[PDB]
């Protein structure tokens, strides 16, 4: 079998380039490597039985390489983990599931498992950023916010909801999810209804105080009405009432 | 003013390990707190909202737990290190030092990975000399060239010195492998078997030609030659030629 042994030696580099070897357990990779080295030495010496024992060991350690078995295990682990991500959309899930099935190395799988958790984490964040959507919309801070600001917020959440919908949401990327998240955060933190009301009450109060058609107590009444107003239009309604008073 | 400080201090915060190794949620919570802070600042012409925003940048920042993550990785690494049984006390001590010096979570995990692969190489090296006694008392070794026997004995002894948990030094993974390759190559190099066959053939030829015996008195000495079990044996029958 002299030739078979030479074959085992020739196939070393090739075998070492394979995933079966690459991801095999260290000890198995080493045993194979040591068998090849042993074979070379034995082949050099030329106890024909020595050549066969050498061949047997190269063939045995090689078959023992279990990188492929380790790949199946890794993929199994990834699929198990993927199913625990409650925030990614179906489209995102199938893409990940696909990348898991398409992965050729243990490192690739884990990398896919890593991106899946990151993406889910981001989706979770985007979901949290808009969990107070309805409440924010009914609040005076949103309602009396500059129209451009109110529109920016409604838009942000709209986009967010589209990305979030598990049934129709596409395979949005991590970068876009983050872009969507920032959109909601900054748009919401921009709502200035609270500030518009404070300024509204100030200008309305100062304007009333300076009106020529009002007695002082009439100004007090109106000023108090401004004080109790809960929103901008409420304030301006009082101011107008003051301008028509005679 | 206090809020802009917390904002202009975001990057000097993202460089730190406490941020980089913090949980994803903790990191984003911080980034978004800053994003909001800027916007909340832009809507000013509600100073409380400026405090609330301040409180959030500070709260989220202090929440960053990259430092705890590191301490966790270290504990894990040390725990795993204590489960290895083949690295030498010297290597173990060196590994512990590496765990202490590490400054990032990935740095710690790399030490754990190296520790395990080292322990593996060590175990493989041990397995390489398990058949030492058997080899030493075998004809393939005994009749092997002087230089080849030395190579195997040098490689084995060197390996045993590397393997002793109590006396072995802090041998690197690569050096463990070289030592391993030396034993394997040296043992496979033993040519006592070849020397014997070379001697039988050499003796047989000498036989076939020595002028003072008989096709009949030495067709059988050749037989004795072929039946010898070692080099001295072949040599033993040979002088039965002069």
From Swiss-Prot, chain A:
Highest taxon in the source lineage: Bacteria
Taken from the UniProt record, the cysteine pairs bridged by disulfide bonds within this chain are: none
Q: Give its localization.
A: Cell membrane
**Can you give the residue ranges of the FIVAR domain?**
1-54, 122-180
- What's the protein name? Extracellular matrix-binding protein EbhA
Please tell me the species this chain comes from.
Staphylococcus aureus (strain Mu50 / ATCC 700699)
Whole-protein coverage range: 756 to 1003 of 6713
